[PDB]
Amino acid sequence: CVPSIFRCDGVDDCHDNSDEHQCGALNNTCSSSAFTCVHGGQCIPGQWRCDKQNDCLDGSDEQNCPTRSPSSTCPPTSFTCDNHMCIPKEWVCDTDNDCSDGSDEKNCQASGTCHPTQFRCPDHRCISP
Amino acid sequence: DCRDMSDEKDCPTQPFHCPSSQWQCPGYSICVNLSALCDGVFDCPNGTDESPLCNQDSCLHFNGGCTHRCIQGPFGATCVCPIGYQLANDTKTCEDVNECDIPGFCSQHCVNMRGSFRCACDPEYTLES
Amino acid sequence: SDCPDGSDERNCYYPTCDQLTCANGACYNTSQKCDHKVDCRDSSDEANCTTLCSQKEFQCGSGEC
Ligand SMILES: *[C@@H]1O[C@H](CO)[C@@H](O)[C@H](O)[C@H]1NC(C)=O
Numbered sequence: 009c010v011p012s013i014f015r016c017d018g019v020d021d022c023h024d025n026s027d028e029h030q031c032g033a034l035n036n037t038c039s040s041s042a043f044t045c046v047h048g049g050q051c052i053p054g055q056w057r058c059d060k061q062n063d064c065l066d067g068s069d070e071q072n073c074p075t076r077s078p079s080s081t082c083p084p085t086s087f088t089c090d091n092h093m094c095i096p097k098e099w100v101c102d103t104d105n106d107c108s109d110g111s112d113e114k115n116c117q118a119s120g121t122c123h124p125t126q127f128r129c130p131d132h133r134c135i136s137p
Numbered sequence: 138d139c140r141d142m143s144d145e146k147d148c149p150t151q152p153f154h155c156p157s158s159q160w161q162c163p164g165y166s167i168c169v170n171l172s173a174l175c176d177g178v179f180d181c182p183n184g185t186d187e188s189p190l191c192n193q194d195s196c197l198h199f200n201g202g203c204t205h206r207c208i209q210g211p212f213g214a215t216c217v218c219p220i221g222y223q224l225a226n227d228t229k230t231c232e233d234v235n236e237c238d239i240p241g242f243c244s245q246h247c248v249n250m251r252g253s254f255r256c257a258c259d260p261e262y263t264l265e266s
Numbered sequence: 267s268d269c270p271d272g273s274d275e276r277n278c279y280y281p282t283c284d285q286l287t288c289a290n291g292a293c294y295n296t297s298q299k300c301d302h303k304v305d306c307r308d309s310s311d312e313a314n315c316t317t318l319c320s321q322k323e324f325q326c327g328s329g330e331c
C-alpha cells in the first residue's frame with residue numbers, strides 16, 4: 009500500500025514497477041530559467057539542476073552533472089570561515105554571524121560609534137546635528 | 138476581526154495530534170512513546186495501553202497494510218509514520234507534511250519533498266546556514 | 267567428523283551431487299528441502315524452511331528461539 013500521491017510521481021514506489029504504469033499526464037511546462045525533471049514532471053530551481061545533492065525523485069538532476077572540479081577553492085568573491093564554510097565577502101562584517109564559527113565577525117572593529125559630525129543616542133543610533 | 142482577538146474566543150480546536158514518533162491514548166488526550174506499546178508497562182491511564190494482541194504477529198501478512206512501519210500495538214495492527222510525515226485518518230496511510238503550506242516557513246521559495254523541504258532565494262539573494 | 271581425530275572422513279573423497287546442498291557439504295533431492303523429514307544429516311535442509319519463534323520471542327540462526 010502506497011499513498012495515492014506517489015502513483016504518478018515518475019519513480020515507482022511499488023517495487024513491481026506498477027506506479028506509473030498508466031498515469032502519464034506530462035501535460036504542463038515548468039517556467040523558464042528553471043528546470044523540469046525528466047521523470048515525474050516537477051519544477052526545481054536551476055541551482056538544484058547540478059549540485060552535490062540530488063533533488064527530484066528521479067535523480068535526473070545529478071544523472072547528467074560533471075565532476076565540476078571538486079578540488080577547487082570557493083570563488084574569491086566570497087569569504088571562508090574556520091568551519092570550512094564559504095559566504096559572500098560583504099557579510100564579513102555585520103551584526104550577523106553568517107557562519108556558525110563566527111570567524112567573519114571575529115576580526116571586525118566591534119564599534120558602531122558615531123562620527124564627530126553627528127550626535128550619539130544610547131540604542132545604536134546616530135543623528136545629524 | 139474583533140480587535141481584542143475575542144471574537145474567536147470559543148473557536149474549535151484541532152486533535153491532540155501526537156507527534157509521528159509517538160502514540161496517543163484513547164479518551165484522555167495523552168501521549169506515550171511507541172516504545173511504551175507492547176512492553177507490559179501500563180503507561181496509559183486506565184490500562185488502555187496493553188492487550189495480549191501484543192503478540193498476534195499482525196505485521197507479516199502484508200506489512201499490516203501500511204506503507205512504512207507496523208507495530209503490533211494494543212489494538213492489533215498499528216502503523217508508524219517517520220519524522221516529517223503524518224498519518225491520515227485512514228489509520229494505515231502515511232503522507233508527507235507540506236511544510237511550505239505554513240506561511241513563512243522559509244524566506245522566499247519552498248519545495249516540498251518526501252518528509253523534507255528545500256528552500257531557494259532569488260538571484261540577488263543567497264541562503265544562510 | 268564423527269571421530270575427534272577425523273579419521274572417518276580423512277581418508278575418503280566425496281561423491282558429486284548438485285540438486286540441493288547442506289552446510290556440511292552434503293546433497294539432497296529438491297523435494298527433500300522442506301518436508302519436515304531430516305534429510306541432511308546436519309538438518310541444514312529443514313533449518314531455513316519456516317519461522318520457528320513467536321513475536322514475543324526472537325529467532326536465532328541456529329534454529330533457536
Ligand atoms: C520518549 O523517549 C525519549 C527517549 O528515550 C525520552 O527522552 C522521552 O522522555 C520519552 N517520552 C515519553 C512520554 O515517555
Ligand SMILES: *[C@@H]1O[C@H](CO)[C@@H](O)[C@H](O)[C@H]1NC(C)=O
Nearest residue numbers: 164165179180181182183184
Ligand atoms: C480512570 O477513569 C476514572 C474515571 O472513570 C478516573 O477518575 C481515573 O483517574 C482514571 N485512572 C487514571 C489512572 O487516571
Ligand SMILES: *[C@@H]1O[C@H](CO)[C@@H](O)[C@H](O)[C@H]1NC(C)=O
Nearest residue numbers: 151152224225226227228230
Ligand atoms: C477522513 O476521511 C474522509 C473520507 O472517508 C474525508 O472526507 C475526510 O476529509 C477525512 N478527514 C480529514 C480531517 O482529512
Ligand SMILES: *[C@@H]1O[C@H](CO)[C@@H](O)[C@H](O)[C@H]1NC(C)=O
Nearest residue numbers: 292293294295296298305306
Ligand atoms: C534422491 O532421490 C533418489 C531417488 O530418486 C534416491 O535414490 C536418493 O537416495 C535420494 N537422495 C537422498 C540424499 O536421499
Ligand SMILES: *[C@@H]1O[C@H](CO)[C@@H](O)[C@H](O)[C@H]1NC(C)=O
Nearest residue numbers: 313314315325326327328329
Ligand atoms: C538460513 O537462515 C539464516 C538465518 O536467517 C541465514 O543466516 C542464512 O544465510 C540462511 N541460509 C540460506 C542458504 O538461506
Ligand SMILES: *[C@@H]1O[C@H](CO)[C@H](O)[C@H](O)[C@H]1NC(C)=O
Nearest residue numbers: 035036037038039040041042
Ligand atoms: C510553459 O512554461 C514556459 C516556459 O518554460 C512558458 O512559461 C509557457 O508560457 C508555459 N506554458 C504553459 C501552457 O504552461
Ligand SMILES: *[C@@H]1O[C@H](CO)[C@H](O)[C@H](O)[C@H]1NC(C)=O
Nearest residue numbers: 072073074075076077078079
Ligand atoms: C569531470 O569533469 C570535468 C569537467 O567538469 C572533465 O570533463 C573530466 O573529464 C570529468 N571526468 C569524469 C571522469 O567525469
Ligand SMILES: *[C@@H]1O[C@H](CO)[C@H](O)[C@H](O)[C@H]1NC(C)=O
Nearest residue numbers: 077078079080081082083084
Ligand atoms: C583555490 O582553488 C584554485 C583552483 O580553482 C587553485 O587550486 C588555488 O591554488 C586554490 N587556492 C588555495 C589557497 O588553496
Ligand SMILES: *[C@@H]1O[C@H](CO)[C@H](O)[C@H](O)[C@H]1NC(C)=O
Nearest residue numbers: 117118119120121122123124
Ligand atoms: C567610533 O567610531 C568612529 C567613527 O564613527 C571611529 O571609528 C572611532 O574609532 C570610534 N570611537 C570609539 C570610542 O570606539
Ligand SMILES: *[C@@H]1O[C@H](CO)[C@H](O)[C@H](O)[C@H]1NC(C)=O
Nearest residue numbers: 148149150151152153165166
Ligand atoms: C479541541 O477540539 C477537539 C476536536 O477537534 C477536541 O474536542 C478537544 O478536546 C479540544 N480541545 C480543547 C482544549 O478544547
Ligand SMILES: [Ca+2]
Nearest residue numbers: 014019021027
Ligand atoms: Ca511512484
Ligand SMILES: [Ca+2]
Nearest residue numbers: 056061062063
Ligand atoms: Ca540536485
Ligand SMILES: [Ca+2]
Nearest residue numbers: 099102104106
Ligand atoms: Ca556577518
Ligand SMILES: [Ca+2]
Nearest residue numbers: 173174178180
Ligand atoms: Ca506499555
Ligand SMILES: [Ca+2]
Nearest residue numbers: 234250252253
Ligand atoms: Ca515534506
Ligand SMILES: [Ca+2]
Nearest residue numbers: 298301303305
Ligand atoms: Ca527435509
